[PDB]
Amino acid sequence: DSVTQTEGLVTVTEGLPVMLNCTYQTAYSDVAFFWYVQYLNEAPKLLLRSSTDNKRTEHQGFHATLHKSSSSFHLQKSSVQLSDSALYYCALSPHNTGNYKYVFGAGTRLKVIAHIQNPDPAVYQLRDSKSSDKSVCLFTDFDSQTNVSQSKDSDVYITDKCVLDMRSMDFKSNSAVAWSNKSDFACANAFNNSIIPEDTFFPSP
């Protein structure tokens, strides 16, 4: 009848554990419990299911144990990865009642952040390939504990940080982009609104 999940966004750094709470309220005794994962733009896909109290279920390093006594079905993982960033739905389904239908919780979005071993913050300027007058400022190589914030100017656009992985080099990096048309737009002036590190490299050139 009622499924209650953790509210909002859960931010965890790669390698660390996670706990996504799910509590319910059901009149029924023979009930099936589920976790569905939804990766960006894809269909929700089953991850775990169980109908038996106190039994633990494991799948992709994701465990969940039914606790009927406290109406709990939490989702856990000991060492989270970047591919784990998704929306997770907790669901309930009473067996043997005629009309089969799920009871979903609102969902919990998990965002996983990179562990940057060797940072070196920098703000470079990139130029357009066709007709080279347009420009973009690239803020890159900062640690995950650095948070980018949007500009106080309505002519300036700043995107949030985003990690990229070069599989060949086993190397990962955080990047954020800034662009504006106005003549009053400098790369040194682009990320003032954000808590940028003291050692942020700014080329002259």
Partner: protein, 238 residues
């Protein structure tokens, strides 16, 4: 096993809309949910019976028809602005767990006049990053599009790449003040300096836009802003 159609729709306030679901796997149950941030997945209509329907938690503003065992369809007579959400179709065997479709992004707007495809541009990596870290980041920018129905991809030397790529999860409003503001999306492709230095290497930024359909009326001067692809190219420099 479960297919949704259309994959995307831009409809008008008042217009007739029809979303179709076709199950290739035989199941007695079929449902239509809408996904909303905060609300999650909510049921609109379901069918236990191969040739009739039953009302879910929010049937208001909707009609649904199951004329086959394999086909469940969603119908809106007066498309309201409220009806814009991602729609999900699921089929299940009663004992069985659901199988889901990929979903349809439906957008009900006032004026199809607000619809615009994106402008894509590739920005060459900085010599400063090329010296300092021996790596080269290419930026792609897709600007001035409405709605935010875009898929961005990178193509190195004719093949799709995923490694050393990162795209914004959600686009960003160009004029956050306005209700029907256009969007912008960025992407980054990071290569080794060698790879960019080589003038014989070709980089392409592909943007699939979802807009108007063939049947949509366009009584405007500019080109009809239909579903389309928009690209921007780059070759290395030494």
């Amino acid at each position: 096993a479960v297919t949704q159609s259309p994959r995307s729709k831009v409809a008008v306030t008042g217009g007739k809309v029809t979303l179709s679901c076709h199950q290739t796997n035989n199941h007695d149950y079929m449902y239509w949910y809408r996904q909303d941030t905060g609300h999650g997945l909510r049921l609109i209509h379901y069918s236990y019976v191969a040739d009739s329907t039953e009302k879910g938690d929010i049937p208001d503003g909707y009609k649904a028809s199951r004329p086959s065992q394999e086909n469940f369809s969603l119908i809106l007579e007066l498309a309201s602005l409220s009806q814009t959400a991602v729609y999900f179709c699921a089929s299940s065997q009663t004992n069985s767990d659901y199988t889901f479709g990929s979903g349809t992004r439906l957008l009900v707007i006032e004026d199809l006049r607000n619809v615009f495809p994106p402008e894509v541009a590739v920005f060459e990596p900085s010599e400063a990053e090329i010296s300092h870290t021996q790596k080269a980041t290419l930026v792609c920018l897709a600007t001035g599009f409405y709605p935010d129905h875009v898929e961005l991809s990178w193509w190195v030397n004719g093949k799709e790449v995923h490694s050393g790529v990162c795209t914004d999860p959600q686009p960003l409003k160009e004029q956050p003040a306005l209700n029907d503001s256009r969007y912008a999306l960025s992407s980054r492709l990071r290569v080794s300096a060698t790879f960019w230095q080589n003038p014989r290497n070709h980089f392409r930024c592909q943007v699939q836009f979802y807009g108007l359909s063939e049947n949509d009326e366009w009584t405007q001067d500019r080109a009809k802003p239909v579903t389309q692809i928009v690209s921007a190219e780059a070759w290395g420099r030494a």
